[PDB]
Design an enzyme around this catalytic site. Structure first.
Site, PDB file in Angstrom:
ATOM      1  N   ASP A   1      -8.773   3.405  -1.741  1.00  0.00           N
ATOM      2  CA  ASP A   1      -7.464   3.889  -1.294  1.00  0.00           C
ATOM      3  C   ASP A   1      -7.122   5.208  -1.967  1.00  0.00           C
ATOM      4  OD1 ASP A   1      -7.102   1.782   0.407  1.00  0.00           O
ATOM      5  OD2 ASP A   1      -6.272   0.504  -1.125  1.00  0.00           O
TER       6      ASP A   1
ATOM      7  N   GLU B   1       0.821  -1.193   0.000  1.00  0.00           N
ATOM      8  CA  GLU B   1       0.000   0.000   0.000  1.00  0.00           C
ATOM      9  C   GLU B   1       0.864   1.254   0.000  1.00  0.00           C
ATOM     10  OE1 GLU B   1      -2.573   1.930   0.352  1.00  0.00           O
ATOM     11  OE2 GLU B   1      -4.018   0.382  -0.298  1.00  0.00           O
TER      12      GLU B   1
ATOM     13  N   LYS C   1      -4.742  -4.326  -3.270  1.00  0.00           N
ATOM     14  CA  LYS C   1      -5.161  -5.583  -2.690  1.00  0.00           C
ATOM     15  C   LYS C   1      -3.965  -6.539  -2.657  1.00  0.00           C
ATOM     16  CE  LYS C   1      -9.692  -4.878  -2.987  1.00  0.00           C
ATOM     17  NZ  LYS C   1     -10.340  -4.121  -1.875  1.00  0.00           N
TER      18      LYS C   1
ATOM     19  N   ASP D   1      -7.770   0.785  -5.755  1.00  0.00           N
ATOM     20  CA  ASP D   1      -7.615   0.067  -4.497  1.00  0.00           C
ATOM     21  C   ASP D   1      -6.449  -0.907  -4.529  1.00  0.00           C
ATOM     22  OD1 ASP D   1      -9.289   0.619  -2.274  1.00  0.00           O
ATOM     23  OD2 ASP D   1     -10.087  -1.439  -2.347  1.00  0.00           O
TER      24      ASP D   1
END
Lengths: 244, 244
Positions: free
Chosen positions: A73, A44, A91, A89
């Site tokens: 995100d 992330e 993942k 996003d």
DNA sequence: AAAGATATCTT
DNA sequence: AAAGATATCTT
């Protein structure tokens, strides 16, 4: 485009660097944990600057959630086009070996997909795209990661909690499956396939309209679903019955 | 004692170093995001080497979970005392402004406390102590400079997403409260109080057996607790009456 | 699979 | 509060 630029950047950043620890301002380095919990946070933060570098190159403002537990995100948008928001996003998931099948949890199926403003940074109908950046790592066989700290001059002595990492950028609907990805926290499941299928976008849905209708009507338990649908065929049979 | 030493080292380390990002083997530094999922990962990782050093000095082996979904973070024990294992769990929460009331989620109430071997590294009847290393941080909002990479020379310039981190070490039964900490994921809730109450151990349970008895019989939902009990007063009346 | 674990947060 | 959200995993 933004998407192809972002995809190349992601491959590149991943090819060059291997995150290996957290660093204090005083220069003291702490090794990484063994979980996906630790690695999903790391991938992330690793993706943040890349995404931001590329969005600015194409004229997109980048916004992260201001409140916790709000998707996505990353929200990209030009201010001239407020209803062309792009949702990104990150993942993460693992593989035991470099040739097995993986699966992802693709977000709730009862929040923003059934309610325009629930747990979403901007109302759902303001987004025209929902991309997933997927990271796949192979766990290392060792379950006893470093338990001491390091200095800046020791970066290459630090064991990393993964032996290989791969990344892809793909639309959420394309890789979506028909089996839930989680039970009590009602998450859409992606397909169950090899990394290349994710890259290649070999999904089970025929359209994003079909992806959305399916998860919007999917029941939470096995019982309710057995009277409606459990998979894509049964949903296609349910459409034929008059949505009943 | 292990406990006095462990807390001094935690409190000392907290006051001397500040995590400011993740680092790659190549030396490129990635800043920290603001959500608690990031800060809980960091505080977990920051505590690992401290815990390990202090356990070693007391001749304690440190074992981390071999499978995800297994409490606790750190299992301490001596080969001479296999049934006197010590569970240490790292818990993190935030504060909008320095020193407001805080609450923690203290683990499931439907896993190892109701089943000796469920989601726990070792059978729960081999642990004589369950410690919580709790971290409180005051939230600091993310900015521009946090979305780029830094180098080792700029270590002191990286914006941090938190302020005023406090840390405590305390028994889980001692800071445990009587309201659930989460609904669908059935977690024990801590007391809802200021930092100093956690340090000093101003909980609501008179003993660890009460805590255990309360949480092994707490019902999962309001409707089911209406009959039985929803808080300590009611549990003491239910007990008084004969568990009915 | 399905159902519920893992940690913590919002409404 | 209670309830169900955030992400991913087991089993």
């Amino acid at each position: 485009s933004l998407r192809s630029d972002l995809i190349n950047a992601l491959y590149d950043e991943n090819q060059k660097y291997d995150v290996c620890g957290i660093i204090s301002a005083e220069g003291k380095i702490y090794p990484l944990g063994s979980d996906t919990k630790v690695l999903s946070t790391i991938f992330e933060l690793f993706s943040r600057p890349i995404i931001n570098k590329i969005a600015e190159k194409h004229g997109y403002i980048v916004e992260e959630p201001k409140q916790e537990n709000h998707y996505p995100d990353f929200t990209l948008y030009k201010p001239s086009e407020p209803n062309k928001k792009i949702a990104i996003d990150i993942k993460t998931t693992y593989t035991n070996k470099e040739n097995e099948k993986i699966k992802f949890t693709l977000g709730g199926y009862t929040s923003f997909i059934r309610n325009n403003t629930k747990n979403i940074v901007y109302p759902f109908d303001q987004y025209i795209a929902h991309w997933i950046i997927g990271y796949v790592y192979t766990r290392v066989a060792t379950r006893k990661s470093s338990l001491k700290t390091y200095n800046i001059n020791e970066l290459n002595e630090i064991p990393k909690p993964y032996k290989g990492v791969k990344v892809f950028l793909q639309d959420k609907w394309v890789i979506a499956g028909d089996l839930a990805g989680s039970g009590n926290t009602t998450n859409i499941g992606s397909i169950h396939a090899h990394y290349k299928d994710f890259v290649e976008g070999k999904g089970i849905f025929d359209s994003e309209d079909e992806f959305l209708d399916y998860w919007r009507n999917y029941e939470r338990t096995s019982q309710l679903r057995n009277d409606k649908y459990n998979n894509i065929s049964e949903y296609r049979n349910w459409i034929y019955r008059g949505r009943k």
